Amino acid sequence: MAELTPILPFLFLGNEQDAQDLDTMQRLNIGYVINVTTHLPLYHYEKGLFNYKRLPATDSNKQNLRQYFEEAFEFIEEAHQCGKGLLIHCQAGVSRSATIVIAYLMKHTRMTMTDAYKFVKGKRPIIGPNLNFMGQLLEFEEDLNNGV
C-alpha cells in the first residue's frame, strides 16, 4: 500500500496503514513500535514480534505531548543500543508522531525546531499543521537550550 519513511537509520515515521504492513516491518529490521493514539490496536501484538509503547494522545488543541517526550526518547535509544529499528506512527497527517520525531531531533541531534521540521518534512512531505503541538515544540527548544 504505502511506505514508512526512514528519518534516521533506526527511526521510521508512518501512518496507521503503514503500520499494518508486517512484511515491510520485518524487512526493515523493525523491532520497536510507538503507537501515538488512544484508540487504534497495537497492530501485530499477538504475533509476539515487536516491543510496543503506546502514547494515548488525540490530535486536538488541548493535548499535551511534552509529557511523553522523555519516555519516547528512551524507547528510541533502546532500539538504537540493540540495533533494531523503531516505527512511530499515529494516523493520516502524522501530526502527533511527527511532533515526537521532531522533539527527538531537537534533543538528540541539537537541531533547532524549525530545522528539525524542515528535515522531517523533506523526507515525509504531508504533515498536518497543529499549532498546539508547535507551541509545545517551541517551549521544548527553550527548555532544552536553557538547561533541561
Ligand X SMILES: CSc1scc2c1-c1nc(SCC(=O)C(C)(C)C)ncc1CC2
Instruction: Compute the least distance from the CB of residue 28 to ligand X, in Å.
Output: 23
Q: Is 115 helix (H, G, I), strand (E, B) or coil?
A: helix
For residues 121 and 109, what is the distance between their CA atoms, to the nearest angstrom?
Answer: 16
Ramachandran sector of residue 142 (left: φ over 0; alpha: ψ -120 to 50; beta: rest): alpha
Nearer to ligand X (CB atom), residue 5 or residue 99: 99
Q: Which is nearer to ligand X, 17 or 114 (CB)?
A: 114
Alpha carbons 59 and 22: distance in angstroms, whole number: 25
**Nearer to ligand X by C-beta: 51 or 132?**
132
Task: Report if residue 58 touches ligand X, rule: CB under 6 A.
Answer: no
Number of C-beta neighbours around residue 52 at 10 A: 13
The grid cell for 11 is 527511526
Choosing from 4, 90, 100, 137, which is the catalytic residue? 90
90 is known as an active-site residue: yes
- Within residues 67-126, the interface with ligand X by CB under 6 A covers 95, 98-99, 102, 113-114, 117
- Name the one range near ligand X by CB under 6 A: 10-18, 74-82, 128-136, 139-147: 128-136
